[PDB]
Amino acid sequence: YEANYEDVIKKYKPADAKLDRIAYDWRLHGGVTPVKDQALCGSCWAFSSVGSVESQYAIRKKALFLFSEQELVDCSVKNNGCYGGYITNAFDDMIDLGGLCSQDDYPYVSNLPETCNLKRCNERYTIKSYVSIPDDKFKEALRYLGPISISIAASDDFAFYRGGFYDGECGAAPNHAVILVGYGMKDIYNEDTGRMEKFYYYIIKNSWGSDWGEGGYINLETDENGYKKTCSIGTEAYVPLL
Amino acid sequence: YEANYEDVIKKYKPADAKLDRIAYDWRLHGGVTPVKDQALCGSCWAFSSVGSVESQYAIRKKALFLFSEQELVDCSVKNNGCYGGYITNAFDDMIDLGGLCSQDDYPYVSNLPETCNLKRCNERYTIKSYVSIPDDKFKEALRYLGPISISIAASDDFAFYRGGFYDGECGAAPNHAVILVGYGMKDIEKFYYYIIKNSWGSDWGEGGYINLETDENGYKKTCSIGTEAYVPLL
Amino acid sequence: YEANYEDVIKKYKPADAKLDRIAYDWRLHGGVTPVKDQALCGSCWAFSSVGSVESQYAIRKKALFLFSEQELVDCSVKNNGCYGGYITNAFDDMIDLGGLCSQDDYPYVSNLPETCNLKRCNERYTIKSYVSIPDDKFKEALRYLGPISISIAASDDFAFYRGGFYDGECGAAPNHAVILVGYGMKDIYNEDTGRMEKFYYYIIKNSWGSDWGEGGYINLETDENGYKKTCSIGTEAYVPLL
Amino acid sequence: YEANYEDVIKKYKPADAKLDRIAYDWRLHGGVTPVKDQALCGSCWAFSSVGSVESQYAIRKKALFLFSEQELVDCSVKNNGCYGGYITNAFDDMIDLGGLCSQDDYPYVSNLPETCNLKRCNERYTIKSYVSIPDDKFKEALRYLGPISISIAASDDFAFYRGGFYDGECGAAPNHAVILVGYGMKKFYYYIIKNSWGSDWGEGGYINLETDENGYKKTCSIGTEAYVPLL
Ligand SMILES: *[C@H](CS(=O)(=O)c1ccccc1)[C@H](CCc1ccccc1)NC(=O)[C@H](CC(C)C)NC(=O)N1CCOCC1
Ligand SMILES: *[C@H](CS(=O)(=O)c1ccccc1)[C@H](CCc1ccccc1)NC(=O)[C@H](CC(C)C)NC(=O)N1CCOCC1
Ligand SMILES: *[C@H](CS(=O)(=O)c1ccccc1)[C@H](CCc1ccccc1)NC(=O)[C@H](CC(C)C)NC(=O)N1CCOCC1
Ligand SMILES: *[C@H](CS(=O)(=O)c1ccccc1)[C@H](CCc1ccccc1)NC(=O)[C@H](CC(C)C)NC(=O)N1CCOCC1
């Protein structure tokens, strides 16, 4: 079910398109659905992967599609429900299970044990494949493909982040799954330099509710090319395709 | 602080531009920030006004700026916090107070009683003026000026709306404030509608939105939308 | 299905039991279940009535029972869902429908239109009857019968209440339904008469979440007798009976 | 500072009282306030210690008092806010800060950073001292003193518990603070633990953890640290 980026970007980027590397934000272009809250459950892998599919349907279909993380939690045998999972495993099971359910047909119950029951789903929403995004290609992928389901190495500082300029530690190993929804640049005073410097960042959608960070989001530092990774973002990185 | 529509539309509409009256949606074209939730507080006036400014900043500065409704609730002496307010009064106070704060500097605490404290804002974001939009000119104003802060007469049916073709009643008097973010047309008979962004969370309406019937000219109002109607200007 | 207060109190109040009119709080005696949130919906009548039943179950069966307001919203033909209803209508339909469902079998979706489907319920939880509480008997009924489903005249001040000593306006007419869960007394300095004065109060459980009032509760003034009504509480007042 | 158990219990256990080792539940006898929720913040140490003081005030003063965890998170210098703390440090600081605030005066906003401002409080609610409960005195201390603030070794299984007979793993080391609110039996003896992750965790916010009749068996290292505050 995996395609190669090399082939996919040829299809999605227009022939004569020039990438703007300074700023692009899918929140301004109808590509981002409301932030969700995983409550007390390690289902980040489901929120990341399903949210990336929500975004792809918004972009490609220009309408609001809200899907069920609970269905993956209950039915994705390749993953471990609230005990954790993988981005690739999740997309594989989206395909093999016959698609996602709407959020209203299959509502979220977090750590409450629930049997898998797809007979509760009326309509089903499939993806065709998914594509791994190379670490030197995040801005291009984000601009032409859409938001990216990414791993992140989250710390306690990240857990307790309530907005403002992030100065926290990163985790050792990737331990969380979030979504990249854009990039930007602002002028920020640089204390090791003693003046205003360009500060490039990726915009990350988390799944800990809109009371975490900045409306559920965080800006993490990158560079103009967008190769620099803060907290190991996108070590695993995939966009779902219709 | 109020400018005139005839002058403003001259500066903003390119010469020889022709208006597409069928459809135009600012969510697609960089002009709409996510939906917020006022919680158990009657601060709709703050959300409508501040949201129209977020939309202008997006359109003119090409990045997402999130501003503080709580600052207005707390510090807008011309309004009454959670007990209600007015669109014009809210824009006047944004000007008189020295501008908006960021959402992160001054976070939303709804009906929690809280004193004005502008010391906690670092950067500030002003508007120069605002313009009243004539009722016969909403599509023109949306397309060339941007999202409009509007009054609406909301009913119980409107409160309980969770998606689909709206066929509920209207309220008896303007009682709420929302934002017009575009217009569209579907074939249902052609059905022309305005796209309204509300401040009751993304689990109201359709992700926080409702389509309200108009006509091709866009003169027809459902729920007395835009009886009061203003775009803020930078 | 309405019983007679006079006959009911004689069965529930022990012989030689003497009422303590100072203080009694069912939250300190295992008779009150968690505060819930009706969200954007006029289903207070269902929160009031179901909550009082949760309380009777807790008191009489000494275990935790959490029931479904959504079932009444969906299925109570004598009420009007999010547009409102009545306490007695609610109890009448609990009986006619064949009992309440658990909260987990039939979760709350507020203003989302939902068909009545009692096949979703596995176990059902009935009541036998209900009794109207006279305005001169609230403390006696609270102590020996239990928490009372009551009407209240809620104003905008009441809506925006976030705790502390209540001094807002009351509404004109009853427009809301809450639960009386107890009564108390504290000594409060009068600014003013320069004397401590006894302040008697009822304890009201609301259904606007834990972030309203004092953990979802409000203390409203009464007198030692408990006859005095603040915000017309208990104009209509009922206890369900197992 | 701390008090001594043998002094405290002789004074609090009535002369010729006899311990019922089978069941005693403070939820029924006027000693437990509603379950709260720490949200996304490691302030369990504050919920535990404050909750035990809410419990003591309820038993001794016979009315429900709600106190401020946020005050301790913001103001306890010996602890590290959302990054964690200790049961003794918490009690020390409520003594040294001059008491707890009402929940109304100093409401909870979890991980949202706030500076300590005690000017927000009118009335203050002090404790006089607190006492450590020996390994072999949980049931006794429970019956005659009240709810105990305790440490617990909580696992992933524990975190994801939503009711029923608990058969999950225990944690490697104590990493959490709860309140013991009683004991019961159904063949099967247990302690009753009040948690601070909302009423939609466990059994309405509670978990029964296996013990024995004397109350010597400890599941999940409960009460490695074990204290009752005193008025
Ligand atoms: C989601 C991350 S979280 O729950 O939001 C979070 C947890 C801890 C620290 C910071 C954030 C889950 C947590 C899984 C978990 C971890 C510990 C106890 C219970 C549950 N993370 C994952 O699912 C990651 C995702 C990868 C993209 C890194 N996967 C994962 O941890 N595992 C994969 C399957 O085996 C379990 C381990
Ligand atoms: C916001 C709208 S709302 O809270 O979402 C709403 C309330 C009632 C019905 C429908 C929607 C506020 C509500 C103010 C209020 C009303 C009653 C009790 C408490 C609070 N509405 C306003 O602020 C309107 C906006 C205008 C542009 C129409 N203004 C308003 O009602 N007033 C102006 C100031 O004085 C009080 C009245
Ligand atoms: C619940 C009260 S509320 O929504 O929590 C509330 C009231 C006042 C201030 C703030 C919140 C419902 C609301 C019904 C409603 C009213 C207006 C518009 C939409 C919905 N109140 C009731 O159900 C009352 C309860 C009685 C015990 C007083 N009943 C009621 O309003 N009706 C009876 C049935 O017909 C409809 C009217
Ligand atoms: C509360 C426990 S918790 O956050 O509710 C929790 C535990 C297990 C599973 C899910 C939730 C805090 C956690 C503090 C913390 C730890 C790691 C990362 C972020 C925050 N635990 C404590 O405060 C314990 C209490 C003892 C009685 C065990 N103490 C503690 O962790 N520390 C002592 C003071 O310095 C920091 C470490």
Three-state secondary structure of chain C: CEECHHHHHHHHCCCCCCCCCCCEEHHHCCCCCCCCECCCCCCHHHHHHHHHHHHHHHHHHCCCCCECHHHHHHHCCCCCHHHCCCHHHHHHHHHHCCCECECCCCCCCCCCCCCCCHHHCCCCECCCEEEECCCCCHHHHHHHCCCEEEEECCCHHHHCCCCCCCCCCCCCCCCEEEEEEEEEEEEEECCCCCCEEEEEEEEEECCECCCCCECCEEEEEECCCCCCCCCCCCCCEEEEEC
Chain C: touching chains (3 or more CB pairs < 8 Å) = A, B, D
Pocket test for ligand 4, best of A156, A169, A175, A208 (most atoms within 8 A of CB): A156
The length of chain A in residues reads 242
Beta bridge partner(s), residue B206: B209
**Cβ of residue D166 closer than 8 Å to a chain A Cβ:** no
Residue of C nearest to D198 (CA): C34
Asked if A48 and A178 touch (Cβ cutoff 8 Å), the reply is yes
Helix axis angle, B44-61 to B87-96, nearest 10°? 60
Q: Minimal CA–CA distance to D153: which of D228, D207, D219?
A: D219
Helix, strand or coil for residue A90?
helix
Q: Minimal CA–CA distance to D28: which of C240, C27, C139?
A: C27
Q: Report the alpha-carbon distance of residue A146 to residue A237 in Å, rounded.
A: 12
Helix, strand or coil for residue B59?
helix
**Cβ of residue C216 closer than 8 Å to a chain B Cβ:** no
* Torsion angle (degrees, nearest 10) of CA C63, C69, C71, C72: 120
Distance of CA B146 to the CA centre of its chain: 10
The string of DSSP codes covering D87-129 is HHHHHHHHHHTTSBPBTTTS---TTS-----GGG-SS-B---E
Asked if A183 and A59 touch (Cβ cutoff 8 Å), the reply is no
C-alpha distance from residue A163 to each of A166, B226, D27, D113 (Å): 7, 35, 39, 10
The string of DSSP codes covering D188-216 is -EEEEEE-SB-TTSTBTTEEEEEE-SSS-
Residue A177: enclosing H or E segment and its boundaries?
Answer: strand A176-190
- Chain A contacts in chain D segment 93-132 (CB below 8 A): 111-113
Beta bridge partner(s), residue A150: A178, A237
For C1, the token pair is 């299905």
Return the beta strands (E) in B82-175 as ranges: 129-132, 148-152
For A151, the token pair is 């791993």
- Chain D contacts in chain C segment 58-87 (CB below 8 A): 62, 64, 66
Chain A: touching chains (3 or more CB pairs < 8 Å) = B, C, D
Measured at the CA of C181, the angle between CA C179 and CA C183, to 5 degrees, comes to: 125
Q: In a 10 Å sphere around its CB, with 0-12 CB exposed, 13-18 middle and 19+ buried, how is residue B62 labelled?
A: middle
Q: Which long-range contacts (CB under 8 A, 24 or more apart) does B79-85 make?
A: B79/B45, B79/B46, B81/B41, B81/B43, B82/B41, B82/B42, B82/B43, B82/B110, B82/B111, B82/C160, B83/B42, B83/C156, B83/C160, B84/B42, B84/B45, B85/B43, B85/B45, B85/B46
Sign of the dihedral through C-alpha A222, A226, A232, A238: positive
Burial B183-221 (b: 16+ CB within 10 A, else e): beeeeeeeebbbbbbbbbbbbbbbbbbbbbebeeebeeb
Q: Provide the residue type at D121 as one letter.
A: C
Return the ligand 2 atom nearest residue B82 CA: 20
Q: In a 10 Å sphere around its CB, with 0-12 CB exposed, 13-18 middle and 19+ buried, how is residue B129 labelled?
A: middle
What letter does residue B200 receive in the DSSP assignment? B
Q: Report the alpha-carbon distance of residue A109 to residue A102 in Å, rounded.
A: 14
Please give, rounded to a whole number of angstroms, the shortest distance from the CA of C57 to a CA of chain D.
14
Determine the distance separating the centroid of ligand 1 and the alpha carbon of D197, expressed in angstroms: 19
Determine the distance separating the centroid of ligand 4 and the alpha carbon of D43, expressed in angstroms: 7
Q: Report the alpha-carbon distance of residue C195 to residue A149 in Å, rounded.
A: 66
> Are residues C113 and B82, on separate chains, in Cβ contact within 8 Å?
no
Q: Minimal CA–CA distance to A26: which of B59, B63, B183?
A: B63
Q: Is the CB of C88 under 6 A from ligand 3?
A: no
For A72, the token pair is 């993956």
Determine the distance separating the centroid of ligand 1 and the alpha carbon of A26, expressed in angstroms: 26
- Beta carbons within 8 Å of D173's beta carbon, 6+ residues apart: D153, D221
- Phi, psi at residue C58, to the nearest 5°? -65, -40
CATH top-level class of B1-234: alpha beta
Q: Is A231 a catalytic residue?
A: no
- Beta carbons within 8 Å of B234's beta carbon, 6+ residues apart: B56, B57, B60, B126, B127, B128
Query: Atom 2 of ligand 1 has which residue's CA nearest to it?
Result: A176
Q: Report the alpha-carbon distance of residue C226 to residue C125 in Å, rounded.
A: 32
Q: Minimal CA–CA distance to D69: which of D17, D29, D13, D114?
A: D114
Measured at the CA of D74, the angle between CA D71 and CA D76, to 5 degrees, comes to: 80
Q: Report the alpha-carbon distance of residue D18 to residue B224 in Å, rounded.
A: 75
Q: Is the CB of A36 under 6 A from ligand 1?
A: no
Give the ligand at the shortest distance from the Cα of B157: 3
- Phi, psi at residue A77, to the nearest 5°? -70, -20
- Strand pairing category for C2-3 and C129-132: parallel
* Residue position matching structure tokens 């909260």: C103
* Residue position matching structure tokens 């930078």: B234
Residues of C in Cβ contact (< 8 Å) with A114: none
C-alpha distance from residue C188 to each of C200, C202, C217, D93, D99 (Å): 10, 16, 19, 28, 20
Domain boundaries, chain D: 1-231
C-alpha distance from residue C56 to each of B69, C241, D40, D48 (Å): 43, 7, 34, 29
Q: Report the alpha-carbon distance of residue C132 to residue C228 in Å, rounded.
A: 18
Q: Minimal CA–CA distance to B200: which of B176, B181, B223, B180?
A: B176
For B102, the token pair is 């960021």
Helix, strand or coil for residue B221?
coil
For D179, the token pair is 């309140």
Residue of A nearest to B109 (CA): A211
For D198, the token pair is 């909302």
Q: Is the CB of A157 under 6 A from ligand 1?
A: no
Nearest Cβ partner of D64 from C28, C30, C62? C28
Helix, strand or coil for residue A124?
coil
Q: Is the CB of C234 under 6 A from ligand 3?
A: no
Q: Report the alpha-carbon distance of residue A204 to residue A221 in Å, rounded.
A: 11
Helix axis angle, A87-96 to A44-61, nearest 10°? 60
Q: Report the alpha-carbon distance of residue C237 to residue C134 in Å, rounded.
A: 8
Q: Minimal CA–CA distance to C217: which of C229, C201, C233, C205?
A: C205
Please give, rounded to a whole number of angstroms, the shortest distance from the CA of A30 to a CA of chain B.
5
Q: Report the alpha-carbon distance of residue C190 to residue C168 in Å, rounded.
A: 18
Which CATH entry fits the domain spanning C1-242: 3.40.50.170, 3.40.50.1950, 3.20.20.70, 3.90.70.10?
3.90.70.10
Q: Report the alpha-carbon distance of residue D189 to residue B234 in Å, rounded.
A: 70
Residue of B nearest to A60 (CA): B28
Q: Minimal CA–CA distance to D36: which of D105, D135, D128, D110?
A: D110
The end-to-end CA distance of chain B, in Å, is 12
For A14, the token pair is 């227009």
Q: Minimal CA–CA distance to B143: which of B14, B7, B48, B233?
A: B14
Please give, rounded to a whole number of angstroms, the shortest distance from the CA of D2 to a CA of chain A.
32
Q: Minimal CA–CA distance to B194: which of B163, B226, B168?
A: B226
Q: Is D117 a catalytic residue?
A: no
Asked if A71 and A47 touch (Cβ cutoff 8 Å), the reply is no
Residue A189: enclosing H or E segment and its boundaries?
Answer: strand A176-190
Query: Phi/psi zone of residue D130: left (φ > 0), alpha (ψ -120 to 50 degrees), beta?
Result: beta
The length of chain C in residues reads 242
Residues of C in Cβ contact (< 8 Å) with D58: 28
| Alpha helices by DSSP H, B62-137 | 69-75, 87-96
The end-to-end CA distance of chain C, in Å, is 12
The string of DSSP codes covering A57-74 is HHHHH-S---B-HHHHHH
- The CATH T-level fold of domain D1-231 is Cathepsin B; Chain A (3.90.70)
Q: Report the alpha-carbon distance of residue D71 to residue D46 in Å, rounded.
A: 9
Asked if B231 and B131 touch (Cβ cutoff 8 Å), the reply is yes
Measured at the CA of B61, the angle between CA B56 and CA B63, to 5 degrees, comes to: 95
**Cβ of residue A160 closer than 8 Å to a chain D Cβ:** yes
Helix axis angle, C87-96 to C44-61, nearest 10°? 60
Q: Minimal CA–CA distance to B225: which of B203, B204, B210?
A: B210
Measured at the CA of C16, the angle between CA C12 and CA C19, to 5 degrees, comes to: 70
Asked if B173 and B36 touch (Cβ cutoff 8 Å), the reply is no
